Amino acid sequence: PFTRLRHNGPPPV
Amino acid sequence: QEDSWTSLEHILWPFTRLRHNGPPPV
Amino acid sequence: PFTRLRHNGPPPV
Amino acid sequence: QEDSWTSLEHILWPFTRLRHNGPPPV
Amino acid sequence: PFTRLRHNGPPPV
Amino acid sequence: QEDSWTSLEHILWPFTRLRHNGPPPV
Amino acid sequence: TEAQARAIVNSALKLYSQDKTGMVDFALESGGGSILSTRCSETYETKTALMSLFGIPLWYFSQSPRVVIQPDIYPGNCWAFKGSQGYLVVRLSMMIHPAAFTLEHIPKTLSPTGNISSAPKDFAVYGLENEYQEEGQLLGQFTYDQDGESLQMFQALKRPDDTAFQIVELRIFSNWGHPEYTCLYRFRVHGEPV
Amino acid sequence: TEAQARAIVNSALKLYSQDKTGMVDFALESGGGSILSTRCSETYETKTALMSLFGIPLWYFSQSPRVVIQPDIYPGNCWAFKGSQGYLVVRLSMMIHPAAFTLEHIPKTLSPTGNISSAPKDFAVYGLENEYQEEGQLLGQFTYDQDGESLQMFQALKRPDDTAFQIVELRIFSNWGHPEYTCLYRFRVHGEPV
Amino acid sequence: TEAQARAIVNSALKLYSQDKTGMVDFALESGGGSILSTRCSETYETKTALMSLFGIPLWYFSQSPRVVIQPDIYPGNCWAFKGSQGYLVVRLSMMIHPAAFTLEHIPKTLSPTGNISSAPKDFAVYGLENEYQEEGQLLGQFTYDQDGESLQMFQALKRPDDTAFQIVELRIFSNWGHPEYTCLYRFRVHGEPV
Amino acid sequence: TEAQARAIVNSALKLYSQDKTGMVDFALESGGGSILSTRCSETYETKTALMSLFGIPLWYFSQSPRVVIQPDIYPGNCWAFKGSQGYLVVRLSMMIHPAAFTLEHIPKTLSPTGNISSAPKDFAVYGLENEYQEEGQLLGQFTYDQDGESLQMFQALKRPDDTAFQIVELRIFSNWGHPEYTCLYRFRVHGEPV
Amino acid sequence: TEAQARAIVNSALKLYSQDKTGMVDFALESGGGSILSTRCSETYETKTALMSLFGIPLWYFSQSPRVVIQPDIYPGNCWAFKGSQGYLVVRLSMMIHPAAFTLEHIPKTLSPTGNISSAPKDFAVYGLENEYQEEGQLLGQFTYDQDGESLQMFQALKRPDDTAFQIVELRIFSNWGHPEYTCLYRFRVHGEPV
Amino acid sequence: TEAQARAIVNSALKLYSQDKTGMVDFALESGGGSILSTRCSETYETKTALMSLFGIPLWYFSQSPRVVIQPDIYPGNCWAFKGSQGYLVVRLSMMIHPAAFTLEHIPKTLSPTGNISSAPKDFAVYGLENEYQEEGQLLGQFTYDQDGESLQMFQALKRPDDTAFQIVELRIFSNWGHPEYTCLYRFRVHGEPV
Amino acid sequence: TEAQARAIVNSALKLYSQDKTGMVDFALESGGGSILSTRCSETYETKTALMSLFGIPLWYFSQSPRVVIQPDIYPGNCWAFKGSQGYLVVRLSMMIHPAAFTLEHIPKTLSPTGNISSAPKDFAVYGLENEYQEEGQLLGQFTYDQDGESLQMFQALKRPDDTAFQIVELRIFSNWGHPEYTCLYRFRVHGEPV
Amino acid sequence: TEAQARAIVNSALKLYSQDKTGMVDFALESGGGSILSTRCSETYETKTALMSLFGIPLWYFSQSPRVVIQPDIYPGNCWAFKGSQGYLVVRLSMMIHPAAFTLEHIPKTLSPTGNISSAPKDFAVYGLENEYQEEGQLLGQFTYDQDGESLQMFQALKRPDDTAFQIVELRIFSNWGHPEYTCLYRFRVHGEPV
Amino acid sequence: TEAQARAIVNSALKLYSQDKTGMVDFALESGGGSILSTRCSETYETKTALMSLFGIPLWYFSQSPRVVIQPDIYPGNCWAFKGSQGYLVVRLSMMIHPAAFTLEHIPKTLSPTGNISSAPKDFAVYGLENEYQEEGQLLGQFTYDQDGESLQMFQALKRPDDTAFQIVELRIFSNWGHPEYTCLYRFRVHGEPV
Ligand SMILES: [Cl-]
Ligand SMILES: [Cl-]
Ligand SMILES: [Cl-]
Ligand SMILES: [K+]
Ligand SMILES: [K+]
Ligand SMILES: [K+]
Ligand SMILES: [K+]
Ligand SMILES: [K+]
Ligand SMILES: [K+]
Ligand SMILES: [K+]
Ligand SMILES: [K+]
Ligand SMILES: [K+]
């Protein structure tokens, strides 16, 4: 099934 | 779950019409 | 997920 | 659940072909 | 929901 | 379950690009 | 007798155009009736109506109990349930005092098989106070007459009080002899809103 | 008079089978009419929705305006708009000089509620040269009569010249008293093609 | 003559309600007929049917030959095949001795153009012993008459012996002048089961 | 003059940050304004906006009239209507006495072509008492000046009495020469609530 | 004879690598051939389906007819049709005068069941001028020999004139005894382009 | 004083362009902040912002708590929670020693309502060591001043040690009087990375 | 010796074309074999084969155990399981008395790495009566010889009875030294149907 | 000097509001620029994915290259490519003679990490006559200065003739020290249209 | 000579089964080669490949340059680039000293047109030290011979020193006369790892 994910690590900046 | 909803809302936004039937929160 | 809803209230006629 | 199935069946109906391999219930 | 099926019976050959 | 994944992978295969960043298993 | 004739014809056509009866059908789906499909008998499953797409076999078609509260009565547009007795639960569009019921079946003259042995024969209608009540209040015992008209009407029992219902269960106790299935084309519920 | 009786009856049935009027309906969808949905009033919002997705309820409506140009008029197969004023824009199957219009509503005898207070009452029909034309040309002002027949026909204004239209706007100014909504079962456009 | 008048009216309405003919239609899809879609001529791409879901218009499609064995005959609910010649093969719900065929087209009074030039004109019907048979038995040669009634009935040739058929081919050789396509609303097969 | 310089700078920046005007915009969508999209002229199909999801480009679309009441004014974030005449109806977030209107367009220095020929030129603003009213009260006639500042303010005519409006119509009669379309970046409505 | 032995072996390998025949296959899909799936027999329906959706089992098939014009012939990569008669319609990559045809089936030694009773036996090939042409032109009658080689070639009829075809119909009239289905691994069309 | 003036203006514009403060906002979503939406108060639900598609009512719009860590502060682009006190939990993009917080609200001059009674008034900020800790370490008690500047900054308590946090909870204990809801436009977290 | 040479070459090519062995492979997927993927060892996961779409990283590719029962043996088209010993469970297309097994690996001459240290070395094959049985009946112990031919065949143990199996487990007890993974290109099961 | 002070401030604000430069950006997406994503470096792969489907993690990325030609430059709204070298191909809204380029990055004061080591350092701009042209024409070599202003402008090489371009390639040869990736916030192309 | 004949045959078949050459192909995708698709010339839009799922045809697509490093060479399984000149960059599975290259095209005997005018004719191969390098080391200049064998091998220039390459560029300068496109079936890179 469709299932989003949390990242827990900061994005590129 | 609602990350899915907000990305769906992004897809839908420009194509829908928005009518206020009363003042929105501001 | 996709999930239908029952209405429990009569339609316009 | 099967409300979803019947609306999918509405979508599919005109584009499918129907073959009876035996008498349907009447 | 989408749900695959096992066959348990051999295909045409 | 993963029958669904492999048929999705069949759909996706010709349109994706494959980059090896290291040797694949052989 | 000519103007009287035109009046009679217009009267007959007008009645015909009003769902053939001129009476509200509180079970009719478009007006708000619905099947409680978890409280219906098992649907009869043939693997014989094959739907295909681009020649690929896709799924086997069979009618749902919803057709019982839809108006089309061309042959085949009926709900076939398994065996020769069964039941269907219908939620009405309004809370009513039920007064009468209608059952329709195709006429024999249109049946490809030559007979209507799949038609309901002995049946009863019960009023249910909630969707979990199993037996309910008997509203009437009746027989659909295979030698009668396509559309048949049946008067509910006259009871000292008037209890209102928004759920009715149709119990078919027998059919006209078909061994595999029983076919219901249309069931209507008539009465007075509260 | 017996053969004359048969002739009268056959005439009545023949007319009945020809969409009750014997006249082309240039708005009929299957024959080439279409609703211009971006120019119609907003469909009435029901209290509950048809489904949910990701926890958000979706589709708060019963019928789309397409049903107004489809022939089924069982109760509930009507387009509901909010309140007692609204409008519907229809592209006809051909460029015509409009001669008459038809409005149908259910009879009071088939209404679950006992009344047809949701039927249109006062209305007007305009011809549009383009669907974005702001002010149309008046083709007529009319009232649908709740004490009259289910199907009512209305004569277009008699024009000195002849301008043809392939788009018409139906404006409803009032209903027969329902506060929440107005329900349109069917609107037809009759006339002579150019 | 009053009671007789009522009897005449009721007899006419009863016949009308029985698919207008009072006869089994063994080609009717809902009753068990099927199109052999691999043995039909080319569909003309009209793309005049709208498909929507949840009120959202999605796309335009063309009617399949299945509509030839479905009962709705509002204008546009027909199968358009390319040009003025074509053929359609239908498997019947029973093995029968064919007695007659019916072709329906809309009346000119309901056609937007004023004419029914797309209607079939000259046609023939053949019996096939199996769905792979190329050369069938001629059951009749006919013309659909554009100046006649909407529904027309045609009598089969009865061979001196009695061969039964469960497969029928309709060959259309010409239409009433439309250059692009021919539109077939309904074809029925009548007869006696074996 | 140093402390005074800082005060002048801070006053200017503060005004700039308050939507450049320091005034409520009662047409602003996020604050409660709405387009009456059934009462707008035709959108020109530019198809110059890209839609993607997850970085995957999907398809090109054209801007809706909603952008006229949203604040972004980078080049291209405008509603293009067909030709050089059009109209837009907006429902305001409050019932107000209108005092002024603002029209913004991009400056020539940011336009790729060197000119703003697609900008509105002659326009008028009307007050409507309800969304079905055809003939409104003239609130002003104006020209957007292609040689002036990007944001231009226009003073409403104040009638001797005080009628309040919650619906406003912008009519554009001409543009600065673009033959295909006119592009509207932002329209604001200012005034005093009742 | 050693160099001659190497020459014979290289010749054999070279031919083997050239699709086993050294001849253009104008039906090969990757080279421009295509199955006209709306004109082919219905794909064989397996007992179980490939998935379910909303509780309804979907896709009761193994392989689509496309595999007939793809080169893999491992057991199971064949198109199965119902029974022992069927047909396949193929559009070739060019307009050609057909000279020969190839049919491949698995060898008996690779069949899990021990037999190849599902292989085609008697068949014919027709050229079609249009895919809706009812009767094709016979290019040949042949038998696939279960005691012969896996790959078998068949010579087209020698024609007085030369009509070219870009569509061919393969009709199978019989199989080698399997009652349920017939399985086609590969069909090739050879000839000279116009 | 001219060059000094240009320096002052450039300095002010530069500060303005740096998110108005020149300080990292560790709560900002694009830089890695996120709402822990299961630990926020109930969102205020109006059924008054209706999104429709082709005129079909589709869903009722309301802003999520994510907008609190997004920069747009046009009126309406705020999270409305139910009642006059509530809480929001924010995960920061880095583990920091928190030094200060910023709250923004629209100025009264831009509010359609004439007031900002929906703004937060009394509030506190707590540091949480894990997403399940309920109270946390108090980082400060403050009041947003409705008579003050749109953007307000608040210094965290000076504590003998320095504990680092990557989760902070904003508790709003009161608003400026709106009975239905409280509206948060933007909350920022400033401090020193570990 | 020339005709004898041609016979030898045709014999060799014929054997080659029959899956190189001329024997049924009851594990082959297209013929009905399947992996019981919940009873296979852990797949080796590299994040090094990146699939992207429009430049967006999409997913990391790795081969499933299904490739072990597919014929392609180009380098890389193998199932890599984690470590140097593991197991794979295969359901055969028929109930058979197993007689022999085949293992294929790429030859060293085609390996980019210069070696085939990832090839299976010591292994055993067991027959399982049901998919939950853990050890099963030993059908044989073998070694794949890295200095041998690409394709190697192994004879099952001769046992006094003949028990039939439709599930076989291949246990690899060691590889040829690769520290990270073991790569299986193809495993075949031969025998006699019941 | 007070009026002069107001003039200086208004001039500064006016320039600020005109995209900070007062110059057309022919790369701006909303104005008609587009990323040619099949010619850009591969987007940087984040450690974790955005979702999963059927157990497979999907979408390992933060921002698509489109953000490079969109005006928002809050931290994180940048396109990250792998390592310290990469390229971006942009189609301009018009055919121009390029005169100057702009690169923006966040200021050090807004960076969560305290540094902007991910900013581009040494770069070059090329004009392409076709997007598949292998070697472009050098328009300039430049360095983005981490000790300079957030927005930096660079003068294109002065050409003897004038060749126009509608496609430009930005090549980054180095960054300011971040080992994993380089982040591009915004690139603008200025010049004179043909 | 019989045992010798068998040895010759077996040696030939063994070489044939080892990718026809017995040599590692370091460009092969499955073994670790990759296309640098941002450094390939334009794909010609043939749209001659059909995509289906579950037997349902969905849409036509064109082959990507990935097919140049995949082994299937049936007619049509090639990458078509626009015109008669193009280039392709491939990253190899190992750092190698290149010794030879192979180009394959279909034989004329398998081409529907009788010719292979779309085949590459004049080409050169360059070694690149990193994927951003513009000017590579020439490894050879060659012509693919339309009158030669399907698979052709080409010897690299060996420089006096030994530089190894893991990136290779194929430049095609001309084809055998097809004006629209050139079709590349397979390119292999052979050599010795470092
Ligand atoms: Cl079904
Ligand atoms: Cl929402
Ligand atoms: Cl994978
Ligand atoms: K029914
Ligand atoms: K209707
Ligand atoms: K029909
Ligand atoms: K705007
Ligand atoms: K095949
Ligand atoms: K905000
Ligand atoms: K394999
Ligand atoms: K940006
Ligand atoms: K290839």
Residue numbers in the entry:
A (entry chain E), C (entry chain E), E (entry chain E): 543 to 555
B (entry chain D), D (entry chain D), F (entry chain D): 530 to 555
G (entry chain A), H (entry chain B), I (entry chain C), J (entry chain C), K (entry chain B), L (entry chain A), ...: 618 to 811
Reproduce passages from the article:
The Linker of Nucleoskeleton and Cytoskeleton (LINC) complex crosses both inner and outer nuclear membranes of the nuclear envelope to mechanically transduce cytoskeletal forces to nuclear contents. It is formed of nuclear SUN (Sad1 and UNC84 homology) and cytoplasmic KASH (Klarsicht, ANC-1, and Syne homology) proteins, which interact within the nuclear lumen.
The third KASH-binding pocket of each SUN1 trimer is located on the underside of the trimer-of-trimers structure, away from inter-trimer interfaces. In other crystal structures, at resolutions of 2.0 Å and 2.3 Å, we observed no third peptide, with the KASH-binding pocket containing only water molecules. In absence of KASH6γ, the remaining structure was essentially unaltered (r.m.s. deviation = 0.1 Å). We conclude that the SUN1-KASH6 structure is a 9:6 complex in which three SUN1 trimers are bound to six KASH6 peptides. Further, their distinct conformations mean that all KASH6α and KASH6β peptides of the structure are oriented with their N-termini directed towards the top surface of the molecule. This asymmetry within the SUN1-KASH6 trimer-of-trimers structure positions all six stably bound KASH6 peptides in a manner that is suitable for the insertion of their immediately upstream transmembrane helices into the outer nuclear membrane.
